[PDB]
Amino acid sequence: HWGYGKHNGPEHWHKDFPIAKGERQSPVDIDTHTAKYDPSLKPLSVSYDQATSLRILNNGHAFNVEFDDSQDKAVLKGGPLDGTYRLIQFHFHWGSLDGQGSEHTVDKKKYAAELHLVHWNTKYGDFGKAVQQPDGLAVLGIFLKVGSAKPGLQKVVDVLDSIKTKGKSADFTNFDPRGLLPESLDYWTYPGSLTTPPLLECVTWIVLKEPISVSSEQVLKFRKLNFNGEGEPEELMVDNWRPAQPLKNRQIKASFK
Ligand SMILES: NS(=O)(=O)c1ccc(O)c(NC(=O)NCCCCO)c1
Ligand SMILES: [Zn+2]
């Protein structure tokens, strides 16, 4: 099965998922001088006031905080998107060291981690249909740098002891994802893919310019999770990021100068 090790990591994925070598793969390096400011880009509309978090799950590759997506409760609109996209889950990718962990890079700079708020286009009816469409998902990507703590992340950090190993889940209600957002919603955007298998080319990526700061203790607690299931040999869940992929025939657009 695929993963992030020496024998099943990102350089192996194409053998089971040939789209790994496709034309719109993610993540990418964001060359800030080559991105083009698009003044027609609209401000992002993040409407998370009615969000209903349900549960947090260790799936063996990351942890997902899952939301009720059966109504328009937490939606992303505007920006480059047409229509309404519903929040289904968020998760992170992170490193073994503070100098690495993000999937996207900014002028080759790697951040300590990257948050992915995953949304699907309501015109396709459900997430499974949406991932089969070139405009099916919108993933809002937010970089994490190590510095001051992020208070809105702490409820996530504190529950991780309950989901240490693959397949463990915990109730996780009343979590407000607005506590994970930076001040500015300035963003870069480009067409891309899921960054884990099945690597489907269904994502409008929206990557925020401004990182959030989290404390060293917060990211340390991410690194105590396990890729393995309970009663299996312990592999720390670290470096669960795919490196930057070729940009090919794509232009990254910026909502700001
Ligand atoms: N990193 S991402 O581009 O924001 C991303 C957003 C939504 C996704 O569905 C995936 N891929 C995925 O879930 N693959 C199957 C493993 C889960 C079952 O345990 C990746
Ligand atoms: Zn992700």
UniProtKB/Swiss-Prot annotation:
GO terms for biological process: angiotensin-activated signaling pathway; carbon dioxide transport; morphogenesis of an epithelium; neuron cellular homeostasis; positive regulation of cellular pH reduction; positive regulation of dipeptide transmembrane transport; positive regulation of synaptic transmission, GABAergic; regulation of chloride transport. Changing E103 to A/Q: Strongly reduced CO(2) hydrase activity. Changing Q89P: In OPTB3; in Czechoslovakia. Pfam families: Carb_anhydrase. One of its GO terms (molecular function) is zinc ion binding. Its EC number is 4.2.1.1, 4.2.1.69. Disulfide bonds: none annotated. The modification Phosphoserine is found at S162, S169. Its main location: cytoplasm. Changing H91Y: In OPTB3; partial loss of activity. One of its GO terms (cellular component) is cytosol. It is linked to Osteopetrosis, autosomal recessive 3: A rare genetic disease characterized by abnormally dense bone, due to defective resorption of immature bone. Osteopetrosis occurs in two forms: a severe autosomal recessive form occurring in utero, infancy, or childhood, and a benign autosomal dominant form occurring in adolescence or adulthood. Recessive osteopetrosis commonly manifests in early infancy with macrocephaly, feeding difficulties, evolving blindness and deafness, bone marrow failure, severe anemia, and hepatosplenomegaly. This is Carbonic anhydrase 2. It comes from Homo sapiens.
